[PDB]
Design a binder for these strands. Structure first.
Ligand SMILES: [Mg+2]
Ligand SMILES: [Mg+2]
Ligand SMILES: [Mg+2]
Ligand SMILES: [Mg+2]
Ligand SMILES: [Mg+2]
Ligand SMILES: [Mg+2]
Ligand SMILES: [Mg+2]
Ligand SMILES: [Mg+2]
Ligand SMILES: [Mg+2]
Ligand SMILES: [Mg+2]
Ligand SMILES: [Mg+2]
Ligand SMILES: [Mg+2]
Ligand SMILES: [Mg+2]
Ligand SMILES: [Mg+2]
Ligand SMILES: [Mg+2]
Ligand SMILES: [Mg+2]
Ligand SMILES: [Mg+2]
Ligand SMILES: [Mg+2]
Ligand SMILES: [Mg+2]
Ligand SMILES: [Mg+2]
Ligand SMILES: [Mg+2]
Ligand SMILES: [Mg+2]
Ligand SMILES: [Mg+2]
Ligand SMILES: [Mg+2]
Ligand SMILES: [Mg+2]
Ligand SMILES: [Mg+2]
Ligand SMILES: [Mg+2]
Ligand SMILES: [Mg+2]
Ligand SMILES: [Mg+2]
Ligand SMILES: [Mg+2]
Ligand SMILES: [Mg+2]
Ligand SMILES: [Mg+2]
Ligand SMILES: [Mg+2]
Ligand SMILES: [Mg+2]
Ligand SMILES: [Mg+2]
Ligand SMILES: [Mg+2]
Ligand SMILES: [Mg+2]
Ligand SMILES: [Mg+2]
Ligand SMILES: [Mg+2]
Ligand SMILES: [Mg+2]
Ligand SMILES: [Mg+2]
Ligand SMILES: [Mg+2]
Ligand SMILES: [Mg+2]
Ligand SMILES: [Mg+2]
Ligand SMILES: [Mg+2]
Ligand SMILES: [Mg+2]
Ligand SMILES: [Mg+2]
Ligand SMILES: [Mg+2]
Ligand SMILES: [Mg+2]
Ligand SMILES: [Mg+2]
Ligand SMILES: [Mg+2]
Ligand SMILES: [Mg+2]
Ligand SMILES: [Mg+2]
Lengths: 205, 151, 262
RNA sequence: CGCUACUACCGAUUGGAUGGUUUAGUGAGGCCCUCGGAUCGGCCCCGCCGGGGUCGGCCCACGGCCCUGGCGGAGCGCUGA
RNA sequence: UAAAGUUGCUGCAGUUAAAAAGCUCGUAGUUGGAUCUCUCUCGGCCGAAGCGUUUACUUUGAAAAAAUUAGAGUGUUCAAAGCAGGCCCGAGCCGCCUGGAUACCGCAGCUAGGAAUAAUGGAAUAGGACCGCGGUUCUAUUUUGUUG
RNA sequence: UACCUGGUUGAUCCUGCCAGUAGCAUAUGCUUGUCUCAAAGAUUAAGCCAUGCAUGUCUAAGUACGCACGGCCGGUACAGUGAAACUGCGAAUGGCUCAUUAAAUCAGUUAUGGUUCCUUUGGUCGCUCGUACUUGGAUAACUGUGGUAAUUCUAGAGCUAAUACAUGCCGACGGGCGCUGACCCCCUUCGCGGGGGGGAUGCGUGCAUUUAUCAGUGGUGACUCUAGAUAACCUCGGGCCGAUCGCACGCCCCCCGUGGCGGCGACGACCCAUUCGAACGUCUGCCCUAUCAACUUUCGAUGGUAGUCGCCGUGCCUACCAUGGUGACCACGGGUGACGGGGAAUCAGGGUUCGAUUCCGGAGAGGGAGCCUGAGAAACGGCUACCACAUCCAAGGAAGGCAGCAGGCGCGCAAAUU
């Protein structure tokens, strides 16, 4: 079938070579796993040595890490925005390694509000729900309030991430290969890389 | 700016450049810590690799490659590909019947790191063996020494 | 081939087995085990060709299936079991103990030992690595893995193992002045004292050895096995003390023995 | 130049021939993906046969609550293959 | 295959027997005149580190499948072969002694000495060696009994 | 054994071939008494095959209610031998041939710090804090009913097992450690404030898997190595954490029990190490041919970036890019009565020729191609198609691969017993 050998290629000088053996089992190849966005659907593949490869065909969730805060959380995947290799992958919404995607921001906001006890992602209208009020304005003792006030010194986030939190969606990059391991894992974009990808996305439109 | 020329972001994989810090340390300098390593066998790391800002995953000093095998030498003949040059190795082959020799040559495509600059055609290069980096490249430039006509 | 090979041609067998050409087409292919195929001695070869206990391969099986032979204190019924360097073979039925040691000709010799000596063996440290939970592990030349070794033991050293419990009793460090035997190459079977070690980064190291009579030679680092500390070995030696004679002096010794015979 | 024979060359022309390439147009079969659902079960709703406890009016009769073995019929109810 | 010094590297011919281009220039190739008599530091005289401007050459050493060839031993009745065999027995009823060597293995790649021959190298717009002395900028470790 | 002789002329000296001489290996002719070894359908046809055989396997230790045999008790599960069948393993080794193949194969030398690995050997296997005195449904062999001209074709019905197929606990289990932390104390302070402890209640936890971050036990010439810490994840086509078998059977208790404990093995299993390998790489090395001088790049040719696929490294493939790469030191193309070496014949010293052939590598099973199972095959004494041949038929269908051992046809100068 699909063979990824080296003897069907031309030589360095440019002349062609005559093969001396037919296709072998260990030189085989398999059709690509075009992973889309939807309810989870994964097929297992029996590979050389008796091992398994998890061929993810459909994925909708994955665990992403906020590196600056070191906060890893499991969040759903919403859409694909940018792809360096080819723009056809963006149109068909294919999940591959190093593609830029949009993920939900709710678990990160919950962790941030439970850690620093500061508002985040809230509108200027100051509308609130009592659960969030008791999460932020809880009655703490002197020692615990002392730790929280000290934590409030380091509570500061760049304007780009704050705007993304206001929008409700974050930009992330996938670091795992969905077609090989069956899961879509990655990290939240931030810093110079976030600016680079924002500029690329804006220029694409 | 000058480094970012591809559709994908060019980063050093082992360096985390998004570590948050106080506003006082941000004003000082935005100097990313450089990743480099000693390749061994007595070869020294060029200062341009340590102090440089280029990104090259195939660089023997700042990339993810391993130097093991044979260490060979050649003369630079062509510099027209991106980050890779063509060198020529000359030798003599012995013919038993006539008790004499004949001149022979080989051509090698080797990877040249951005840390090595001011490399001209006709200077000596010491290369080391690594894993296959492309279809025809299996060696990486380790040292560059100038020609006899250097002033 | 499409997979592992299961046969061994008799002419393609190792030459230190001293097999003859006209007996058959095949030779006993050693089973997988602690020792390499080219560096072991199969149980059948030692049991019928060296000791002359059996005449055919069937009698070797009839002996082995009575659970008479023990290798390193454990009963082996496989007739092609790979037995290698510094191994102990015990036959309780006849009350005999043997240790596999190369002679000066590079062949395994029938070397009888005291039953007291048959309780331990020497091993060469091949690998040192830290495993899960920060537990050191030591891997010897005969595939033995030992947990929690002495922190001073490094690679190329020698450890004494008690065959009953399989635990280290003591060890010898790889230093100049110790006693070593060559386990491979042109100097296989020679015993001497280490003189100096040459280090070649990225390549093989070369070690020089000098014997009792003053003859010097060199080998690679992988072919050296440390036997004893200083000039005193920790095991019993074969008839030849590890000194290789030249052809002229072997002829002289043979002629002297013939003259004194009769 | 006139006789007698052979080999090798041209060259009206088209046959018996095969072999090797490729341009285009079809294309068996396996494998992968998206569908598909012949059929086979398990769980709920009733009915009558059977064994363990208990509750109730109680005296060797009959119901309640659970389990438990089989059997017959529904639900395009649910689910698995 | 030798004979064939009738394919000539050793080692052939080219005036008249077959043969030197009509003549000249010229790139690649081949070839090329003489000359030049180990080192500080750090550690225990040696150990580490730089060696060598580098090679070519020669002499060592290591790694290099068996079988074949060469070759040691051995009365297969000799030999071609084979890797066998020999000794005393009053019987050893624990039988004894001994072999299964060695040489060679081209080229390329490793290792350590030699320094003749043959290549290559330095100080000429001296921004060349060696011993020192001031001026400025950028970072790391330790000592002020610890911690800022 | 470092070797020559006849032939051109009326006669001579030469150049120069022809012929003469000796080995070796194929055939053939004549002849042939005794013994020891010993090649043998390679050359033309990798052309075609009747027939027969060439791969099967059970221990005390997975499953026996076949009287098919068999000893005693006679409900008192199973005495023993054991056909058949389910399960497990092997069948990827060996044997044959040399068609293809010219930096390809192959040889020496290195590398995997860029991968996989049945089995053997050794190491782990209460390290997880959350019906068990043993859980469930079927299937053969067997007993009965059948279909087809025909096969190692199978269909229905009635039974019954597991180390087949599934499902699932207890125990260790007392806690420990990370975060959350109401509340309770102890110092200084007139007091706020500055400190030091204890803590109920909640979440997480072991090894493997995926991602992100932090610090820097042991090792290398060199890791983005090994080990450690932190936040999470952990695939229903699902990683581990034993519902398995045999032999000898014994010590203990407030006891006669739900009795508790215990020795050797067999089988199985996640993960390391080892063994047997396999697979991709580095350097050097191959016969003739210019009446083959430029080749490669539309359809990847050379390199870069990111991905896909793959067991891994890589134009292996994809997208976007640069214009590269090779060549009189002979590229590219063509031929080879070319599988490559270890080797063989002849040889003063050089050298010439051969190597299908018992050893080591490679390739193939009429020619192509695609696959299932499995640790390992693009397997052919496995399967599925096309191409060419070809067997039985009741014309509806079914079954093929001797370059395995014999043997047969054909081919030829040329090669053995069903
Ligand atoms: Mg082929
Ligand atoms: Mg010569
Ligand atoms: Mg085979
Ligand atoms: Mg075997
Ligand atoms: Mg199709
Ligand atoms: Mg000749
Ligand atoms: Mg001659
Ligand atoms: Mg001639
Ligand atoms: Mg001469
Ligand atoms: Mg002549
Ligand atoms: Mg003339
Ligand atoms: Mg002239
Ligand atoms: Mg010239
Ligand atoms: Mg000169
Ligand atoms: Mg060899
Ligand atoms: Mg040899
Ligand atoms: Mg005459
Ligand atoms: Mg002649
Ligand atoms: Mg007679
Ligand atoms: Mg034939
Ligand atoms: Mg043939
Ligand atoms: Mg034959
Ligand atoms: Mg056969
Ligand atoms: Mg079976
Ligand atoms: Mg199998
Ligand atoms: Mg045969
Ligand atoms: Mg090789
Ligand atoms: Mg790899
Ligand atoms: Mg294994
Ligand atoms: Mg049935
Ligand atoms: Mg099972
Ligand atoms: Mg780690
Ligand atoms: Mg890549
Ligand atoms: Mg690329
Ligand atoms: Mg040949
Ligand atoms: Mg051929
Ligand atoms: Mg000669
Ligand atoms: Mg001669
Ligand atoms: Mg040959
Ligand atoms: Mg051959
Ligand atoms: Mg042929
Ligand atoms: Mg094949
Ligand atoms: Mg065949
Ligand atoms: Mg055929
Ligand atoms: Mg076929
Ligand atoms: Mg298997
Ligand atoms: Mg096939
Ligand atoms: Mg066959
Ligand atoms: Mg076969
Ligand atoms: Mg036949
Ligand atoms: Mg047949
Ligand atoms: Mg004949
Ligand atoms: Mg005939």
């Amino acid at each position: 079938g699909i063979s990824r050998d080296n003897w069907h290629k031309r030589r360095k000088t440019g002349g062609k070579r005559k093969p001396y053996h037919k296709k072998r089992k260990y030189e085989l190849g398999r059709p690509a796993a075009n992973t889309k966005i939807g309810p989870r659907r994964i097929h297992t593949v029996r590979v050389r040595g008796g091992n398994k490869k998890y061929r993810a065909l459909r994925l909708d969730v994955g665990n992403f890490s906020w590196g600056s805060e070191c906060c890893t959380r499991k969040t759903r995947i919403i859409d694909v925005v940018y792809n360096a290799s080819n723009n056809e992958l963006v149109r068909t919404k294919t999940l591959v390694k190093n593609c830029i995607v949009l993920i939900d921001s709710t678990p990160y906001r919950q962790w941030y509000e439970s850690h620093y006890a500061l508002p985040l992602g809230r509108k200027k209208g100051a509308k609130l729900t009592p659960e969030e009020e008791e999460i932020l304005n809880k009655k703490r003792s002197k020692k615990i309030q002392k730790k929280y006030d000290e934590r409030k010194k380091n509570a500061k986030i760049s304007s780009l991430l704050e705007e993304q939190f206001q929008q409700g969606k974050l930009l992330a990059c996938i670091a795992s290969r969905p077609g090989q391991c069956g899961r879509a894992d990655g990290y939240v974009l931030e810093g110079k890389e976030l600016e680079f990808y924002l500029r690329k996305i804006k220029a694409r439109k | 700016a000058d480094i970012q020329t591809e559709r994908a972001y060019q980063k050093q994989p082992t360096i985390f450049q998004n570590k948050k810090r106080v506003l006082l340390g941000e004003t000082g300098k935005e100097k990313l810590p450089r990743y480099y390593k000693n390749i061994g066998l007595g070869f020294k790391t060029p200062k341009e690799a340590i102090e440089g800002t280029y990104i090259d995953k195939k660089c023997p000093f700042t990339g993810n490659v391993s130097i093991r095998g044979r260490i060979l030498s050649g003369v630079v003949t062509k510099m027209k590909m991106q980050r890779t040059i063509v060198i020529r190795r000359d030798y003599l082959h012995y013919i038993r019947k006539y008790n004499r020799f004949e001149k022979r040559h080989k051509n090698m495509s080797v990877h040249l790191s951005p840390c090595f600059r001011d490399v001209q055609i006709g200077d000596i290069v010491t290369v080391g063996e690594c894993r296959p980096l492309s279809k025809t490249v299996r060696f990486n430039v380790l040292k560059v020494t100038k020609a006899a006509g250097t002033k | 081939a499409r997979g592992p090979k299961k046969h061994l041609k008799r002419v393609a067998a190792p030459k230190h087995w001293m097999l003859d050409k006209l007996t058959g087409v095949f030779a006993p292919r050693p089973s997988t085990g602690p020792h390499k195929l080219r560096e072991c001695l199969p149980l059948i070869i030692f049991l019928r060709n060296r000791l002359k206990y059996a005449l055919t391969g069937d009698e070797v099986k009839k002996i082995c299936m009575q659970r008479f032979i023990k290798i390193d204190g454990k009963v082996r019924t496989d007739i092609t079991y790979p037995a290698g360097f510094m191994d102990v073979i015990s036959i309780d039925k006849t009350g005999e103990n043997f240790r596999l040691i190369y002679d000066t000709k590079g062949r395994f010799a029938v070397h009888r030992i005291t039953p007291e000596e048959a309780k331990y063996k020497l091993c060469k440290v091949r690998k040192i690595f830290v495993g899960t939970k920060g537990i050191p592990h030591l891997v010897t030349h005969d595939a033995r893995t030992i947990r929690y070794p002495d922190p001073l033991i490094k690679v190329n050293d020698t450890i004494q193992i008690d065959l009953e419990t399989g635990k280290i009793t003591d060890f010898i460090k790889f230093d100049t002045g110790n006693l070593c035997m060559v386990t491979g190459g042109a100097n296989l079977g020679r015993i001497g004292v280490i003189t100096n070690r040459e280090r070649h980064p990225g390549s093989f190291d070369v070690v020089h050895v000098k014997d009792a009579n003053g003859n010097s030679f060199a080998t690679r680092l992988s072919n050296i096995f440390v036997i004893g500390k200083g000039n005193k070995p920790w095991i019993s030696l074969p008839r030849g003390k590890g000194i290789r004679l030249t052809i002229a002096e072997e002829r002289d010794k043979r002629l002297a023995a013939k003259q004194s015979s009769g």
